[PDB]
Amino acid sequence: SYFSAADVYVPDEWEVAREKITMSRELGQGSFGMVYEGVAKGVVKDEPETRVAIKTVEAASMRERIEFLNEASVMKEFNCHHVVRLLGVVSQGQPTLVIMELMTRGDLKSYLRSLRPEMNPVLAPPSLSKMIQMAGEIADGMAYLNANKFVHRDLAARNCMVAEDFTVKIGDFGMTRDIYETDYYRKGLLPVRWMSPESLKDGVFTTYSDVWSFGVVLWEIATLAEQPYQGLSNEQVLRFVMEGGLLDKPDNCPDMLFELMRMCWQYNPKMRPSFLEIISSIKEEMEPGFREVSFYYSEENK
Ligand SMILES: Cc1c(Nc2ncc(Cl)c(-c3cnc4ccccn34)n2)cnn1C1CCNCC1
Numbered sequence: 001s002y003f004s005a006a007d008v009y010v011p012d013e014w015e016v017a018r019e020k021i022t023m024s025r026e027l028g029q030g031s032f033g034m035v036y037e038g039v040a041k042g043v044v045k046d047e048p049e050t051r052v053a054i055k056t057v058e059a060a061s062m063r064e065r066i067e068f069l070n071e072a073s074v075m076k077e078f079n080c081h082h083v084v085r086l087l088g089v090v091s092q093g094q095p096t097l098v099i100m101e102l103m104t105r106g107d108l109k110s111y112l113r114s115l116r117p118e119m120n121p122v123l124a125p126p127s128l129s130k131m132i133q134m135a136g137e138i139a140d141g142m143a144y145l146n147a148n149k150f151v152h153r154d155l156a157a158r159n160c161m162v163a164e165d166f167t168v169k170i171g172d173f174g175m176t177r178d179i180y181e182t183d184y185y186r187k188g189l190l191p192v193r194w195m196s197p198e199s200l201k202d203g204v205f206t207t208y209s210d211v212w213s214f215g216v217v218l219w220e221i222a223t224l225a226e227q228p229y230q231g232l233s234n235e236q237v238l239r240f241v242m243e244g245g246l247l248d249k250p251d252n253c254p255d256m257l258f259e260l261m262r263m264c265w266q267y268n269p270k271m272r273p274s275f276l277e278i279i280s281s282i283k284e285e286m287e288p289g290f291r292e293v294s295f296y297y298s299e300e301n302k
Pocket residue numbers: 027028029030035053055100101102103104105106107110161172175
């Protein structure tokens with residue numbers, strides 16, 4: 001008469017001794033609990049000590065802490081320079097900890113927003129070169145995911161993060177969705193402004209629609225994270241986009257970058273470039289070391 005439905009967490013080789021962990025600065029607050037910065041011993045090869053991000057959950061329910069552990073654990077499948085790494089778990093005792101790679105400059109949306117001139121002398125908007133470097137890291141990260149049979153479905157600037165050295169990576173899954181909440185629309189909460197026409201039509205997502213979204217992220221970069229289709233309602237976006245409407249070339253946006261956007265925003269998904277193809281087109285523009293750290297240039301990219 002039935003199959004039993006009891007969710008559980010299973011300690012594995014990602015388990016890390018609590019005593020090896022310390023927490024300092026508060027980074028913010030996630031859905032299950034507060035997240036801190038801190039320091040973890042013995043979690044990176046040949047690194048006695050590593051600065052990390054610690055996502056925590058004693059007042060929470062066991063159902064919740066279980067849900068949090070399993071979800072967070074999704075990130076375990078990934079080992080790529082351009083994807084935020086999970087370094088450990090402390091499931092034993094409380095509070096529950098998940099130890100992540102620290103991205104000191106936060107999420108890309110926030111970072112981009114911080115580049116906006118205050119209302120003093122200011123840094124000029126990011127160069128073509130800088131923007132392109134970002135585009136390529138993001139694309140490398142997505143290529144990796146695709147190679148790993150994954151479809152992201154929520155690729156946006158908010159869902160990328162930024163390291164100390166300014167490297168952009170595919171962010172820890174699901175961290176800005178409730179923060180940048182107006183970037184979503186319950187029509188399931190969907191990132192309508194980032195979505196392909198086909199996805200707006202039948203609610204299916206592919207790698208090809210991830211590419212669409214990639215285009216939108218580039219647009220974000222070039223606008224310092226304006227709201228796409230800023231003048232339009234959520235409902236009006238559905239129609240515009242489904243009807244072949246496109247985002248405008250941002251002021252001062254270098255031609256080349258807008259061209260990139262354009263390849264991504266082709267109506268027919270089958271005509272969009274792949275992430276690999278995207279990287280191939282700009283690889284010469286990439287910082288030297290890309291060849292050493294990228295999925296693209298690795299033996300895994302076969
Ligand atoms: C340092 C930092 C991260 N770095 C980071 N690195 C790894 C992870 Cl895994 C996380 C993370 C995951 N979930 C949350 C929820 C809130 C804040 C940070 N995180 N954050 C994210 N935001 N920030 C700050 C940016 C300046 N404004 C205050 C926050």
